[PDB]
Amino acid sequence: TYESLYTKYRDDSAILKTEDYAHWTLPTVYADPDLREGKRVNVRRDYQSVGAVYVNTLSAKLAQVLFPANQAFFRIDSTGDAAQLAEAMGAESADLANGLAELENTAFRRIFLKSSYHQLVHAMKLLIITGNVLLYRDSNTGNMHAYSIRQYSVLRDGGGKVLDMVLKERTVISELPVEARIKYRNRKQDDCICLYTRIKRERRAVGEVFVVTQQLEDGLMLDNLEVYPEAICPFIPAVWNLVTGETYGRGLVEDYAGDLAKLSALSEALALYEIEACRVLHMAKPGSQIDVDSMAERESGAWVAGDPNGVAAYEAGDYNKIIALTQEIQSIAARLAPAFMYATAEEIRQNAEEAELALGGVYSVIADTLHIPLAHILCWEVNQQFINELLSNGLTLSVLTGVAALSRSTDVNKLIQAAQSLSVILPVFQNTPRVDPEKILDMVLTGFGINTKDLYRTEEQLQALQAAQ
Amino acid sequence: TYESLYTKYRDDSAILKTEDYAHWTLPTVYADPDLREGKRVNVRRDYQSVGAVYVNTLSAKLAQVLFPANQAFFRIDSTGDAAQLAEAMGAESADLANGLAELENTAFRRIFLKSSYHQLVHAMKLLIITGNVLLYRDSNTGNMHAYSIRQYSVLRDGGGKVLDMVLKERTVISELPVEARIKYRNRKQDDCICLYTRIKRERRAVGEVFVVTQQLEDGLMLDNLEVYPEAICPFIPAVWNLVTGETYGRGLVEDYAGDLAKLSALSEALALYEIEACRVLHMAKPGSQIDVDSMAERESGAWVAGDPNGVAAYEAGDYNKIIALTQEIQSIAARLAPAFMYATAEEIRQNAEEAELALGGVYSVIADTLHIPLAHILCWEVNQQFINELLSNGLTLSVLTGVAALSRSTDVNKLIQAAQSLSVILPVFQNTPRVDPEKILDMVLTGFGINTKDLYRTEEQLQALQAAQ
């Protein structure tokens, strides 16, 4: 009876309010799937297209910053406890730094298989306009899909923890498993049948757990029970702005509804004036001597008798109004521009920082709510054994995010500077025997923020080098 | 009776609505083939030509970005499972990297044989204007063809999976096989006869399958049964924008119909004024002393008696209206410009990124829906055995797309930078024996994102080099 839960957990007020926001920017992203059965039903548009362009540009731009195509978007600290991390893979105490880097480098490419990038862009659009999205990642094939709030509903506490979810989907009988298709032997046409999925949180001895099950419209279960640890669950609900106490988030467009509402009416008035500007009439002045028939029926080049100014073109003075309205609309549009950001790894650094400045602190929220689970899922896909050992014991991987994934990104810059300075300081002091070069080295290296333990040689290596002479 | 299915699967509303979009941009691309039998039937044009220029420019530009002429448009990851991939070709563990690169480099040239590029451009036009296209690739010869929704119809579930298709085509009796031409012995003229093809999805033990069959108008089958795995099917339906629940997609032009509709009327009014500006009349003022006969019939150079201002040229004041209308039309046209993008491998990178920014996230959709099957088809054409082994077992090739085919494109840039930095850091630290050069190497290389396993020498090679002394 998952239909009962699905209906119970909905919020009609938010669904009804979020129609205008879509109507002002991109109506086709928020279309109701329950009013159509495979045929077009018309969708109306608005008198202005500024919102569409702004939203398209911002959604396209956000994808490049969050998911760069030539470097990983997450880093592993590993400073917590190297013992267990090294014991899981079975490597030396120092080879962990190389192994983690190899895993991170080889893992992030998996996000570009089987059209995931397009779904990511669609999810960004959904988050910007409606502020809610559910993301499903299939490990067997490598494909993803994004859903709107018209196909799912969630339940959470006052503290924000998600407790339950239900998802609706439509299909046909031919797609069902052989076990369940023995029933419904009649009516084996391409008739549509609904399917429901439920995700529920539960706790076992070694931690919390998510349980997945499925059911048809008429109560019948379909087995397929699966259990995942909370860290590697394939379902990811996300929010843009979440007011404490509520269940669903809010979008960026909701903060700027007044300007769009004030712009649509001006656009309508401009359209009315432009349509009025298409009257082509010629007026014959009354009280003037003219020969209308000859003027209107003679071939070009003839001579006629009458005043050379007895006929004039219709004039209403509506051009100045168009000129005036255009300037006001342009001024409002320009004033709205900054809010929507309309205009080597360091380039990505600066772009992300400027996105932080423009958005106001949501880039960090998006990074926090998306980067953490995807990293675990991809790492599990690339190496099952290593993650299985970590989850069974209870401890979990540490990941850095929030414009802070520069752990292995821009350390070479801090080494180049040290090398440049060491080439200027050491040539001097070579003659003076009172200054120890080792202390200068140990001061300069630590000054720039480099852990000397990853560069200095061990005692055994020095002894071997001295012996090899 | 494939005619019944063909008629059943059509959507008349979309077909009737999509006429205006073609009429505003390029009427000849959407002409009905069932109203003509080999003779011209006139096609009407519109008062404005902005849409035609914009569509031509965008369609021409899109082809260069998607299908560059001097590098492959797809890359193979191979990180999934090198065991089976190496076992299929019969190569070593490390020679796979070279073999895959060779295959990718030698495969992509096949797209330029026998006039495929023109069909690709036509398909891009069709996608932009109507948002639907069916693409057929013939392996025997190397030619392609593109069809509009006036010649085919498709069926899909609520989830978007395509289940069935039907295609219509016209020909003559002389083209039929000898087996079927024994019938229809009479009427062996060049009379036109229709032909129908059906593509249906079905599942067998080792995966899903597509079945192709043909039939004439009068029920008679023509044999030619063929079976393809779903991955290497030669038919590819595509969409530009697909609203969940519906069957056919939507085009880019549909988002900007209001501006074009508002522009056509202004163009008509401008044409009316321009036609009015062709009245050449001379008016003889009433109440003035003049000698009209002498003025109008004497040779040039004569002297006449009369006022020097008794005759004036006709004046209606319609020039200012032309000046005004031109500015408004130009302003609207300029405002429409950005939406249609009107204005070394890195150049292609930047061009594709800017296309991503302008379009709003469709470049990725087009790449996802076109690159994946064409890669498999071309690879099968260049090497049948390798693909046959992979498909029989069940596993499939992994391909990267969505402005993410840079796997083997721009790795040399990340190596040049490392080489430049290594030439500045290693000259220093040569005197200090406390810093190990190997650790600096292993840090700098991994910092830029290079898998050291493809550069470092193995233990055996080092031993051999040491012995060779």
Numbering used by the authors:
A (entry chain B), B (entry chain A): 7 to 349, 359 to 484
Authors' description from the paper:
Podophages that infect gram-negative bacteria, such as Pectobacterium pathogen ΦM1, encode tail assemblies too short to extend across the complex gram-negative cell wall. To overcome this, podophages encode a large protein complex (ejectosome) packaged inside the viral capsid and correspondingly ejected during infection to form a transient channel that spans the periplasmic space. Here, we report a near-complete atomic model of the bacteriophage ΦM1.
An adaptor assembly (gp52) interfaces with the portal and six tail fibers (trimeric gp47), each of which appears composed of long helical bundles much like phage T7, as well as adapts trimers of spike protein (gp39) which may be homologous to those in phage P22, another podophage, and 9NA, a siphovirus. The EP3 octamer adapts the locally 8-fold symmetric interface of the ejectosome to the 12-fold symmetric crown of the portal by intercalating the EP3 helix α-2 between the crown domains of adjacent portal monomers, forming contacts with the C-terminal portal helix. EP3 intercalates in a pattern in which two EP3 α-2 helices intercalate in the gaps between two adjacent portals, followed by an unoccupied gap. This results in four unoccupied portal crown domain gaps, and eight filled with the α-2 helices of the EP3 octamer. The C12 portal complex that sits in the locally C5 MCP environment results in a symmetrically incompatible interface that is best characterized by C1 symmetry. In our 3D classifications, we also identified two populations of particles in which ejectosome structures were aligned, but portal density was also rotated by ∼6° about the Z axis. This suggests that the ΦM1 portal may also exist as two discrete particle populations. Reconstruction of capsid dimers to low resolution reveals a probable interface forming between opposite and opposed adaptor proteins. Inspection of the dimer interface between symmetrized adaptor models auto-fit into the map suggested that this oligomerization likely forms due to formation of a putative reciprocal salt bridge network, forming between residues Arg25 and Asp23 of each chain of gp52. This hypothesis is tentative given the poor map resolution.
